[PDB]
Structures are given as structure tokens and as C-alpha cells.
């Protein structure tokens, strides 16, 4: 049976790790040959989930073409967020919930994206469509993904489908989703032993907005001041990235997960576009984004319109 690799985006989050694991499980339970893998380091939030449900981290890879011919993408599509040698392999399927850009195939494929709050919400449907029992631990990881992406059902990307899936997955996993999820989210918001290099990369994604090359990085925190007091050090590593990668904009989005508000730190030639996007005045490279917590819903589309 031909082996495939299943993985999500660089700088993996809980949905990208757990959805890779769950989809590989669903493929293997159906008699196929899948290995879930990851493209970077496991963050504290994901590690809490993996540890709680006694699951291993997926194997770390840098490339796929040395290993297999065919891959499945979960939780992303854009080339520049994917494995570095993505053009050397065939993308067989994509299960996702981001916007689509920078994605092309030579041949028809199974592309399944729904505008829902979490990729694992789609995978939940797929288990059922295929009449495969979701094991307790798998359900736990899928629930983790949903709580992560929805910030415990508070993010505006969260839909009724995500809430229903989480309800099913929590009963199967044997946990209280509120209690568990609060602890899980807090594990990811622990910024104590985090360097600024880590802060600006742990949840970084690159985009091309029109002709403009952009990186948007997000940080979950229980206290914006703890991050903001590192501003000079953050500006230094972000500046290095802006130069190195020839970005028109690096936007760091520092999210208060308790208040659902974010502080923007914008660096690069196109910083003033953030002002247009959000109707704010940047003062010393920062501004308050009231209510903004979702990159896919509240940052990418308005920043696209502003940049163009």
C-alpha cells in the first residue's frame, strides 16, 4: 500500500498537529498507509494536549520527496506555508479552512475546505461518513484542535458546527471541554521561557497580498504588557526577518485571549497599510486592535483590501 505523509503548516499549531494525526488515523483505519508528520517544533499548547492524551509527537521532517511521492495537506494550502520541497511531490488531498492562494495542482484532487472554525471539525464529519470509530485519545486531540482554533468557542471563526463537534468529541474523550480547554490554552500562553525569536515565529505565517510579501505572526497572552515591554527586542528580530526575507510588512499580532483584544506591532515599508486596514493610528509602531483575534477572518481580508 503506497505510503503518504500528512502534515499541516510550518510553525505548527494544535490543529495542524492533531488534524495530521487524526487524518492519518482515519486513513490507516480504512486500510491505507499514512504517517502524520510535522514541519517544526511542537508548542506548549500542543504538548499539553499530546501529554494529556498520551500521544506522541509526529516525526519532524524538512522534506517529503526523499520519502514519498504523494502527500496530504491539513490546515493549509499556500506553497510558502507548506513543506519546502512541496513542488516535488503530488498533493493528493487538502483538508482545510483558510483562504486559498498560491496553490496549484497538475491534476484533479480531493480538495475539502469549509469556512468553519477548525480543520478537525471537518475531520469529525469524515470519520462518520466513513463509519470509523473515533478512539478516546484521538477525540481528545480533535477537541484540543477545536478549542485551540476557537479560543474556547470565543473566536468569531467558531460556528455551530464547531461547537457540536467539540461536544461530541469531549464526551468521547471523557473530559469537560471548559476545564480541560482552559488549562490547555493557558499552557500555550506561558511566555516565560520564550525568546523573542520564538515569539515572532511560533505562530508565524507568510502571505503574498497582491504584489506585497507579508509575514503575520500571532502570540496568545494573558497580559499584553508582558509582551509589549520587550518591544525593542521584538523590533530587532522582526527587522532582521523583514530584511532577510524582503518583506513589505511584518505584522505581529499580540492577542489577549482573556479580553479578545490584540496589539499590533507593524514593521516594514507598508506599515501604514495596517492603519488603513484597521482604522487605527500606529504610534511607535503599535496600535490597539479592539475585538481582533482571528487572522483568517479579521486580519488577512481587510489587510488585502488595504494593501491593494
Find the binding residues for Fe ion in span 14-73 (CB under 5 A).
15-16
Asked if residues 17 and 122 have their Cβ atoms less than 8 Å apart, the reply is no
Question: Judging by DSSP bridges, how do beta strands 261-267 and 286-289 pair with one another?
Answer: antiparallel
248 assigned ligand-binding residue: no
Site string for its own copies, 94-113 (x = CB under 8 A): ---xxxxxxxxxxxxxxxxx
Find the binding residues for its own copies in span 270-299 (CB under 8 A).
296-297
Q: Tell me: does residue 65 bind its own copies (CB under 8 A).
A: no
Least gap, CB of 234 to its own copies (angstroms): 28
Q: Tell me: does residue 15 bind Mg ion (CB under 5 A).
A: yes
Which residue number, 97 or 199, has a Cβ lying nearer to its own copies? 97
Burial of 49 (0-12, 13-18, 19+ CB in 10 A): buried
9 assigned ligand-binding residue: yes
Q: State the cell numbers at 31.
A: 486500510
Which residue number, 286 or 294, has a Cβ lying nearer to Mg ion? 294
162 assigned ligand-binding residue: no
Binding site for Fe ion (CB under 5 A): 13, 15-16, 75, 119, 149
Binding site for its own copies (CB under 8 A): 97-115, 157, 296-297, 300-301, 304-305
Binding site for Mg ion (CB under 5 A): 13, 15, 149
Amino acid at each position: 500500500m503506497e505510503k503518504i505523509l500528512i502534515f499541516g503548516h510550518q510553525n505548527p499549531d494544535t490543529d495542524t498537529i492533531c488534524s495530521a494525526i487524526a487524518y492519518a488515523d482515519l486513513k490507516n483505519k480504512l486500510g491505507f498507509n499514512a504517517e502524520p508528520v510535522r514541519l517544526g517544533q511542537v508548542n506548549g499548547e500542543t504538548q499539553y494536549a499530546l501529554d494529556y492524551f498520551k500521544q506522541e509527537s509526529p516525526r519532524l521532517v524538512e522534506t517529503a520527496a526523499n520519502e514519498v511521492n504523494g502527500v496530504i495537506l491539513v490546515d493549509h494550502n499556500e506553497r510558502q506555508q507548506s513543506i519546502k520541497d512541496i513542488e516535488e511531490v503530488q498533493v493528493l488531498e487538502v483538508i482545510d479552512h483558510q483562504r486559498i492562494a498560491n496553490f496549484e495542482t497538475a491534476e484533479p484532487l480531493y480538495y475539502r475546505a469549509e469556512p468553519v472554525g477548525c480543520t478537525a471539525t471537518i475531520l469529525n464529519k469524515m470519520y462518520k461518513e466513513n463509519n470509523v470509530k473515533i478512539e478516546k485519545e484521538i477525540a481528545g486531540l480533535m477537541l484540543s484542535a477545536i478549542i485551540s482554533d476557537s479560543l474556547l468557542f470565543k473566536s468569531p471563526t467558531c460556528t455551530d458546527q464547531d461547537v457540536a463537534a467539540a461536544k461530541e468529541l469531549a464526551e468521547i474523550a471523557g473530559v469537560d471541554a471548559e476545564e480541560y480547554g482552559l488549562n490547555m490554552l493557558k499552557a500555550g500562553a506561558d511566555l516565560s521561557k520564550k525568546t523573542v525569536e520564538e515569539l515572532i515565529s511560533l505562530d508565524a505565517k507568510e502571505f503574498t497580498l497582491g504584489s506585497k510579501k507579508v509575514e503575520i505572526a500571532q502570540v496568545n497572552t494573558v497580559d499584553i504588557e508582558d509582551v509589549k515591554k520587550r518591544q525593542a527586542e521584538l523590533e530587532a528580530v522582526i527587522s532582521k526577518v523583514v530584511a532577510e526575507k524582503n518583506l513589505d510588512l511584518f505584522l505581529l499580532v499580540i492577542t489577549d485571549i482573556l479580553e479578545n483584544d490584540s496589539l499590533a506591532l507593524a514593521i516594514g515599508n507598508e506599515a501604514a497599510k495596517v492603519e488603513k486596514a484597521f482604522n487605527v493610528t500606529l504610534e511607535n509602531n503599535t496600535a490597539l486592535l479592539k475585538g481582533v483575534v482571528s487572522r483568517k477572518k479579521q486580519v488577512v481580508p481587510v489587510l488585502t483590501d488595504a494593501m491593494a
